[PDB]
Amino acid sequence: QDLEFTRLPNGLVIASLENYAPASRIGLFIKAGSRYENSNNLGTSHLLRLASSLTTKGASSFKITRGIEAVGGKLSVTSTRENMAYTVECLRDDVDILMEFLLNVTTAPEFRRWEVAALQPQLRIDKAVALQNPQAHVIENLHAAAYRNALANSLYCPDYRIGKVTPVELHDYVQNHFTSARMALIGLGVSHPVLKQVAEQFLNIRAKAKYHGGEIREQNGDSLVHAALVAESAAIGSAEANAFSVLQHVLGAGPHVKRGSNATSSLYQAVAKGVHQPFDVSAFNASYSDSGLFGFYTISQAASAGDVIKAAYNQVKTIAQGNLSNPDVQAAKNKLKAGYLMSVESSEGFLDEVGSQALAAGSYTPPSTVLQQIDAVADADVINAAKKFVSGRKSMAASGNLGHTPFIDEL
Amino acid sequence: QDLEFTRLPNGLVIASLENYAPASRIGLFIKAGSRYENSNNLGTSHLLRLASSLTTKGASSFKITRGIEAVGGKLSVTSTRENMAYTVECLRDDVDILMEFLLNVTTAPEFRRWEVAALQPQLRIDKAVALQNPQAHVIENLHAAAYRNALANSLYCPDYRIGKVTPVELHDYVQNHFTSARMALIGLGVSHPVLKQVAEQFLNIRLSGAKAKYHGGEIREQNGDSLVHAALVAESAAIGSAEANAFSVLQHVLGAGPHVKRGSNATSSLYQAVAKGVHQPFDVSAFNASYSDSGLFGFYTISQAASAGDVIKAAYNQVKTIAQGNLSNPDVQAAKNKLKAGYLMSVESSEGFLDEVGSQALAAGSYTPPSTVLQQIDAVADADVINAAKKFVSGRKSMAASGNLGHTPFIDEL
């Protein structure tokens, strides 16, 4: 079948693709990420990721939990700095139940304060777990430096707001962003007019990422240095941004082979020529509706990172000068064509690509057309892309034992 | 009497001033602050501030504690990023006891590991107490930005080194910096050759320091607090330079805190300049830090969350106008009278005097009498004070804050 798609006069979107799968899948995306938080109501969105499965006007927290598990369904939340996502899974004989539970969470939650207060310390858990993975320190402390207010906001609540988030801020945040204009309802293995029936019946309701640059240095006790160095980018959808996406793979954005030596990654090889001590490196490419970021992510030892980062910085530098050949670029295209299609292979990874476009575009982009956009990329744009990285103002962030780590200006 | 002074061939210094006070006072200063810590052995000096009153080869931790208290003496430690200080108080009939305890702490401590491990969590206390006073966040997070390695080091141990400081690092830090070349023994109400007798007998003993390379930058510690604490500074002149005295004058011209209780700081150009714009509770004052290698100068800020962006610009402009040339002699003459007072009032006590004696002694080959210091104040020209302000405006900046920064600017917006 083909992906249905439309829009409501209230600005709401619907899609549908009856894949004939046994298990349906429905996902309500939205533009209510963490960038929409001011300095006052921080940690709000982290509470909302957990505020699902709470009391509603349509049902209680107990009915929701068991009513889902009785049919063996699923309920999961995903967030980005821009977008949020409420998603379900179930069998297509059980769609109508999960919707009634889904919308009561989204549309009309009550957020009774005691349930909220019992939920606050869960933040300390979900945060500190995900910060075991050291990248989450770096990336969060990185966006705090590159950008000022909006996209610099953390997905994860800071420590001082714990037990201070009110229901008042939530309902405000609900009413201020959970609007039909910002939403995009999506369903797979499901018919189109059903979601029309649901949305018309129920969902029919009512800052800038200013770049600054800078640097963070989180000295900690750990033998490995985690570090990143980036510059301002192009927003998603620009052909300019596709050039970075190509440039990302030219440098090598992680191994394709298990335990491979990353033979084609110009960075990992360029570092290997200088360094002979365990390391890792890869291309970082973040994109957003207003802006994005590009550069590379670093892992090294405490007494060798100062060599690794310079080598990566020079490899990008040579490519900006003009040192780049077509087949190298053609290879990165074949990678990018693969990275996209392999992402949307599953129902889930597909589902993220559908509504992201739907919120960021007035229509779904078929993947075949995306492949055409890849081929449209010129090698010179990829070079001018690298020029921006070198010439543009930088943003930096690290964590570890920084006894030998340089700064921006030394690079 | 007059302040005795000399130096030993091993590079050790002694002074003495028999003030005929009932209570003696002795202080062993040294160049072993926090700048001498690398990234590996951080928190070391914070442990040493507490590692006093531990076991030694000369005595046990119990003997030291009670033997002092039995005579009602005192033992206190002071540290700076450059210097440390071990000081005592006692009655002059009880000098020889406190010395034997003092030197055994300094000269030959054992640092037996279990006592050390029982002492580690005390760091979490002494730190977090002093960080109740919000300035300590700002100032520490400030030096981390202005400077790279040496003076950027915190006096206070970071959280990850807790329970990881070894005795090995200490004895190394002892042997690497507790040398006779870096010390300066001082005693008041005490005779000179006594300290000569002690030092020659005991202190006659044997890592280099690092540079305070300036970088600039900014820190922004978003927290839940209605008040914004903030600072903005630039690179300075080291202590002893006549250049540095100009800042010290410029410090008082702007107003480095009230002289009157609850006064409106009538002469503080900053507090008045802010007052012309703002009509909501605030505070501001001149910040002037100086060090042997470098220093810092600027101003410290306190404002509300939704008004600091106006306060800092007003202070920035008041300094800016003065750099352009807007400055008169009697305004400058007033700040001199302040500075002449701030110095003399500091060295009024035996204690505040004692810090001024040995600081010079470590940073100079001889004591500077205060009368000569007053001459150096009068030597300052108004134009140097203006060129001083030019450096603040023209030089690269360093910034730091803490609070609700919803409306707070950056360096570049200033």
From Swiss-Prot, chain A:
GO terms for cellular component: mitochondrial inner membrane; mitochondrion. The modification N6-acetyllysine is found at K31, K164, K208. Pfam families: Peptidase_M16, Peptidase_M16_C. GO terms for biological process: proteolysis. The keyword Transport applies. It comes from the Eukaryota. It is found in: Mitochondrion inner membrane. Keywords: Acetylation, Electron transport, Membrane, Mitochondrion, Mitochondrion inner membrane, Respiratory chain, Transit peptide, Transport. It is a peripheral membrane protein. InterPro entries: Metalloenz_LuxS/M16, MPP/UQCRC_Complex, Pept_M16_N, Pept_M16_Zn_BS, Peptidase_M16_C. GO terms for molecular function: metal ion binding; metalloendopeptidase activity. Component of the ubiquinol-cytochrome c oxidoreductase, a multisubunit transmembrane complex that is part of the mitochondrial electron transport chain which drives oxidative phosphorylation. Belongs to the peptidase M16 family. UQCRC2/QCR2 subfamily. Component of the ubiquinol-cytochrome c oxidoreductase (cytochrome b-c1 complex, complex III, CIII), a multisubunit enzyme composed of 11 subunits. The complex is composed of 3 respiratory subunits cytochrome b, cytochrome c1 and Rieske protein UQCRFS1, 2 core protein subunits UQCRC1/QCR1 and UQCRC2/QCR2, and 6 low-molecular weight protein subunits UQCRH/QCR6, UQCRB/QCR7, UQCRQ/QCR8, UQCR10/QCR9, UQCR11/QCR10 and subunit 9, the cleavage product of Rieske protein UQCRFS1. This is Cytochrome b-c1 complex subunit 2, mitochondrial. The gene is UQCRC2.
